[PDB]
Amino acid sequence: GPSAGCPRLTAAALSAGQDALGPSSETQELECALDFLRGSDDPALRRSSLGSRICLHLAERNSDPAERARFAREGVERAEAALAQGGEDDGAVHYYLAANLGLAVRDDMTAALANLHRLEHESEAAVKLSPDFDDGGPLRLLGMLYLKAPAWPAGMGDGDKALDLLGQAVERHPGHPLNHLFYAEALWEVNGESESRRVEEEMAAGWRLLESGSWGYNKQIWKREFADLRQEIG
Incomplete structure (x- = not known):
């Protein structure tokens, strides 16, 4: 869960402030928010793309391929969770599912080919919705x-x-x-x-x-x- 040095956080504050988190945020800030929302039962946050997006920010910043893929796999899980909780109409959830899935597989030919239909479906959903x-x-x-x-x-x-x-x-x-x-x-x-x-x-x-x-x-x-x-x- 959130580490001990994280600021006090509530779902309402995270939702209101969600765009203050981004590629320029430090890793500690991003993980405080990600680790919080994994445990949140707030309906909006549970359906949000935020957790998956945070995972992509963490993946992109890691030059090691295995470490990047690890965070990308967490982003896939966060987007899948959002879709299961009712985020299916949110184009950004599908977008970050496909973006993280791409990072997780694109350095491995076997995995890339095995996930091409899922990538196509999620990228098309994102293009349709947002x-x-x-x-x-x-x-x-x-x-x-x-x-x-x-x-x-x-x-x-x-x-x-x-x-x-x-x-x-x-x-x-x-x-x-x-x-x-x-x-x-x-x-x-x-x-x-x-x-x-x-x-x-x-x-x-x-x-x-x-x-x-x-x-x-x-x-x-x-x-x-x-x-x-x-x-x-x-």
Whole structure:
């Protein structure tokens, strides 16, 4: 449960203050809130995406793959709990279920393939219910799945749908670094050398947002993803 040094907390205060917690929060602050809500019977909090989101913040800040996956697996459990308690209409619950599930499996091919249907279902639910959440996060997840899943007809993989969704994320939510990064990856992988200028400009814009914006402890893992695309394009 909450550690002994945590501030006094109530469900009402956590709900009212839920947006004061984020990627810039220190780990101790995030865990005080996460450990509290696991034990809370407050109907709203029990249905909320907050616990799953906190787990994703903790996953993203951990460079070790096993440690990151451990927190991501906790986020999957928190989102599943929220859905069982009545959060099914909340697009953010499905979003953080799919985002955490992705982190938990994407470094392991067997697990990624084994969870592709669940990822697809949850990413689609997020896109249906709250496509704009987290600056278009659900479009990011579903678009990347269209880019990375086994290619049609073997699976849902479809580069045109990837480009449609990730282009829509960039158009509708230009402030997020990963909308530009992921769109750039799709442009390169689906269209190749003919989109090099656009790929590069999208990378550069994402990097500028990454460097200037306030992404807290998400910055290091996103920087690694930017480097990955740089190396992929040569």
